[PDB]
Amino acid sequence: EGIDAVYPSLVGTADSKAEGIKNYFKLSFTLPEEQKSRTVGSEAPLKDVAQALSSRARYELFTEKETANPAFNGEVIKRYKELMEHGEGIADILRSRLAKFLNTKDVGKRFAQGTEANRWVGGKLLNIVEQDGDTFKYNEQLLQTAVLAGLQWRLTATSNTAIKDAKDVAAITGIDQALLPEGLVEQFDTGMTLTEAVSSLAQKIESYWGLSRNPNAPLGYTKGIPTAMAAEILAAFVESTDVVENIVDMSEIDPDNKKTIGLYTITELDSFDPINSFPTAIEEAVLVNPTEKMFFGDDIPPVANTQLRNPAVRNTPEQKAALKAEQATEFYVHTPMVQFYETLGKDRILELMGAGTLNKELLNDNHAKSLEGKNRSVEDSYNQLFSVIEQVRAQSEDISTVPIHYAYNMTRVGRMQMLGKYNPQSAKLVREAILPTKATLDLSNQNNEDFSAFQLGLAQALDIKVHTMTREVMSDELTKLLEGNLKPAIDMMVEFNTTGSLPENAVDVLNTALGDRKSFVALMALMEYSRYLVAEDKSAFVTPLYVEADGVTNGPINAMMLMTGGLFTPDWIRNIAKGGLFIGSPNKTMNEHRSTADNNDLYQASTNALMESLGKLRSNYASNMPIQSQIDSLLSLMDLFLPDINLGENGALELKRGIAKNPLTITIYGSGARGIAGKLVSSVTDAIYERMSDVLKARAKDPNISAAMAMFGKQAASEAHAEELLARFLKDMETLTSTVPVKRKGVLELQSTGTGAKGKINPKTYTIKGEQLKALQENMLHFFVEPLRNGITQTVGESLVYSTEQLQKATQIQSVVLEDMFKQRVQEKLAEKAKDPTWKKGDFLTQKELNDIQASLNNLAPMIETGSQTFYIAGSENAEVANQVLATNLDDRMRVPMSIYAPAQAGVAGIPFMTIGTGDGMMMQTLSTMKGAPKNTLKIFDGMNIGLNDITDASRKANEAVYTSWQGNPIKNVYESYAKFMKNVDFSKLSPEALEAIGKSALEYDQRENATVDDIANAASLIERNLRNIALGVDIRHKVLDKVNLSIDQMAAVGAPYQNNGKIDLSNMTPEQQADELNKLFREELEARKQKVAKVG
Amino acid sequence: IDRANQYVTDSIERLSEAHLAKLTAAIASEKQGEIVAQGVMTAMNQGKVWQPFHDLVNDIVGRTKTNANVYDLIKLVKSQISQDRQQFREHLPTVIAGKFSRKL
To answer: Which sequence ranges are marked TM in the entry (chain B)?
Structure first.
């Protein structure tokens, strides 16, 4: 009688075992104990809410608050009057589409005779209708409340959707990640798919309805009825031209692919729309506890209880404390930076920091696609920032004294991420306008310690390697720039502060002065320095300039410290010193190491090893003439378009440290060899497309120019030199696309493909794809990637790559078993429902039944616990388990598949989870909750912005947090979960498909052709004892390193190292001598543990 | 010789307290006739087996640094010698005798 008294006019009885028509709306939802929405019980929600928005006094009375938001002024009130009238016309469209549905094929006539038309996949909206004469009609309270949710969704959906990477797009389309076309990713994130639009809209509809789900009701109605309403509202928005629908066909690019995907984009409002200063008036008027809002002053966001998009995992108490500290920081608006942005204008901002205007008649088709994506990011960030400024400006007359708070949540890899799309932590444009840092300095004397901090901040913003030089040397470098190239730019900024105007050629002045140092952070350095020059009182200068403590190769260094076992080697000691770990050198900073000891970082070290491997490969095939020519063509092509590859006049090959940046970072991230090859080739094709645009530009200026000079005009001193380069380009492309190398029996053989490149090119629409693209990747994989991966292994160590292999095998095997049991357990439950008369196919299972299936998997240890963090590698949301349609609209379109939260195969995702989660993720968690933690800082991943008044103390604390995170044992945590899984697993109950996947990870190629169940089980237990041996070695190494004196300078910006107060002196020793001393303590620790286990003359 | 090698091997394991072994087995088990007529240098060059041998000698000479002690490398060099003697002195004569349908 609870919900049966609020909606007594609904069609059908509320009994699950009735005879006629049953109402599944009242059987699936229940009234809450305390109210959550103010529209429950009303008769005209679209009229009561519109009345409350007509005045400030009425808004306060309806909301029951002392005062409303100051931004809710008269201009905003007028704009909401038109929006409410627009929402009344949306309801008229919905009411007219229902009458057509009941008229075609006599649906209404049959439904009134007893036919269960409300249980259809498209008739699920018939559970919220009422009888009216001989026909049916909507329920006014339910219909008008859903319209209000659509209006709020239309205003803020874009600024809340997630960002799709290349991996996500590949899964949706089905095309291989390494063969994704040009601009496909940039097209996908512009709009949203059907599933994303409907699911997000349906979430708001349920919230506004203010009801609670029934745990014993089928998932086909608790999730289908809200979804069926969302699809109808989205269809109405398309008819009203509020949402534009675009259809992309995969058969155009891949004829073998028959998938069709629709994309929906919301039409955006004007940048001067007054509604942009307060777009959450409807949300705060309906919900008792609004979710979308901006926090001012003492308004502190609440702490989330579960991980991001991982509802099965809850934040640990240690993780919740870190979130609370990060949400207490106050942000402030820098007025001089804001006025500079609006004076320059959006057009000049795009011209300076973007691609500017585009003339598509002189651009390549593929080149123009990338330029538009660059412009979109800058333009969207500019619009988002100035909408916030409008809201802040209404709170007080002084915009610089309004504190701002931001919400945080935990990423599945243990990373604190700001909520929203464009915020200081994500957008660089917004980062320079809203700052949490402040300082007061005495700059009246140039020899003060305060002036040295001021110079350090300016130098780092102007692209100067401050962590590789001493303070005195850095000061000399900055002085030359200030009085040299940057002088014209400073003069313009000085006039701007006093007057407030800019010249018509301001873009050209900044472009010439900055050059290769152009960035958003470099603009603030010019303004801050110019403001200091005109300050009347330099002894109390207040500035928001900061210094960023950036880690030196944070990724690779963490891996070699956390997942390395065995005895110490001199090579490890030398290579780990480049990361900031010094043994036997008290109070040694990174600036001293680079200046005197070693000036090569990890990126340069791997480049040198790559040259060594490349020379050995060529010498192996010295007698093979066809193989030698193929290697020459690959290097020749990369020399023409990549600045990191250079060939001398004598044929000597020279490489730069910039060729191993990306490969080294993604190698630690578990990416395979094919992934590196695909990215390397993509860099070459981008340069080729850009060179085609120069051909079109040169032809327009001079139609009589030659083809060679139109291409390599600026890369050749003479015309004859230009003709030489053109011949090289044509020959290399034909050679690299005609034959490919095939690795058989351990040797490489050239095999023809028959799909070589022929004909005359067209600069406007030149494209490389199909079999031509695959031929290029085959040559790159076997001739350049293989030598590259050998050099990387030599630097990081052979033991580190051994730990990654066992970790990948252990996680993949566990995920395969979990996925098979989940699918095998929901099919047995469905077979039981087939004997239930009150059950129909399409209702799926129940939330109570789904929770029992997941609880039965607890004896296999699906989650990894480290004591302060939790990880769930196999968790995902997929529609494979349900394999059925959830709901459609009244036109039998917009079919939405049903997706549930079920485990899935891991693959190579195990390595990134533990390298990042226990690496920089744990370091930043400690830094926010440690004793005497730094205050007023912005914590970007592997970085931290610090004010000029606390650079020394905060940098020392950052190095202390790094040392704490190096005492962990990620392998031991994985071993403990894997040992429990092996105790309870039963391989004899696995499907034949599952047994084939496990054999691909535990056995060799020859051993898995006819392997039995016993062979697979025996091979899986071997991995268990491999993890135990690795984990024991890591534990001993950390114990030994804690007994000696160490200096930690991983955050090398300032030069404030941290000492571990060890009591063993290893100074005045070579790395060869230190390894022997460390190995002596390693053998003593092993003896004690084994001895403990055993326990006159 | 075989008895002497076994005694020395067992006396080294008392004091200290895989892939190329398969390629050499394929060399001595060839049954083509047109391949064995080209000599044994060609088969080893085509068989890629020269690469695992280079890694071990590089540690003995000292070109490539390694953490293994003397007793670990001695057990590796003496394991390759016994593999060639087992394959070429015992398994090869059985292949030749298996081409006749009779016991000579």
So the answer is: none
Q: Which residues contact A295 (CB under 8 A, 6 or more apart)?
A: A301, A404, A405, A406, A407
Q: Under an 8 A CB cutoff, do A569 and B65 touch?
A: yes
Of A978, A981, A982, A998, nearest in space to A990 by CA: A998
Q: Which residues of A683-714 are buried (b: 16+ CB within 10 A; e: fewer)?
A: ebbeebbbbbbbbbebeeeeeeeebbbbbbee
DSSP characters for A642-701? -TTEEE-TTS-EEE-GGGSHHHHHHHHTT--HHHHHHHHHHHHHHHHHHHHHHHHHHHHH
Give the closest-approach CA distance of A1030 to chain B in angstroms.
Answer: 17
Give the B-side interface with A, CB within 8 Å: 46-48, 65, 67
Query: What is the rounded CA–CA span in Å between residue A333 and residue A336?
Result: 9
Residue A591 · residue A1047 · CB < 8 Å: no
For chain B, the first-to-last Cα distance in angstroms comes to 28
User: Cβ distance A244 to A267 under 8 Å?
Assistant: yes
Helices vs. strands in chain A: H and E counts, helices first: 42, 32
What residue type is assigned to position A825 of the chain? R
Identity at A184, one-letter amino acid code: L
Rg (CA), chain A: 33
Q: Report how far residue A832's alpha carbon sits from residue A1079's, in angstroms, rounded to the nearest whole number.
A: 63
Pairing of strands A546-548, A439-441: unpaired
How many CA atoms are closer than 13 Å to the CA of B50, on its beta-carbon side?
11
Q: B-contacting residues of A 739-758, CB under 8 Å?
A: 745-747
Q: Any CB–CB contact under 8 A between A567 and chain B?
A: yes
Tokens, residue A320: 């919740």
Q: Inter-chain contact B65–A745, Cβ cutoff 8 Å?
A: no
Picking from A84, A80, A50, A90, the residue whose alpha carbon sits closest to that of residue A241 is A90
CA distance A288 to A36: 5
Helix axes A346-353, A365-393, angle to 10 degrees: 130
Distances (CA, A) of A633 to A629, A630, A637: 6, 5, 6
Beta partners for residue A846, in sequence order: A218
A786 CB within 8 Å of a chain B CB: no
Is residue A304 exposed (0-12), middle (13-18) or buried (19+ Cβ within 10 Å)? middle
Q: What is the DSSP string of A857-890?
A: TGGG--SEE-SS-EE-TTEEEESTTT-SEEE--T
Binding residues of A: 428-431, 550-555, 661-662, 942
* Interface contact A747-B67, CB threshold 8 A: no
B65 vs A570: CB contact, 8 Å cut-off?
yes
Cα–Cα distance, A1054 to A956 (Å, whole number): 9
Q: Which residues, listed in sequence order, are joined to residue A131 by a DSSP beta bridge?
A: A136
Q: What angle do CA B63, B45, A793 make, to 5 degrees?
A: 40
Give the experimental resolution in Å.
4.3
CB A310 within 8 A of CB A415: no
Q: Which of B48, B65, B67 is opposite residue A747, by nearest beta carbon?
A: B48
The DSSP letter of residue A287 is B
Inspect the interface and report whether the beta carbons of B48 and A571 lie closer than 8 Å.
Answer: no
SS3 per residue for A1024-1058: HHHHHHHHHHHHHHHHHHCCCCEEECCECCCCCCE
Q: Is A925 left (phi over 0), alpha (psi -120 to 50) or beta?
A: alpha
State the Cα–Cα distance between residues A157 and A144, nearest whole angstrom. Answer: 20
Nearest-Cα distance to chain B for A637, in Å, is 30
Residue holding tokens 């990369």?
Answer: A638
Helix (H) or strand (E) holding A387: helix A365-393
**Closest in B48, B65, B67 to A746, CB measured:** B48
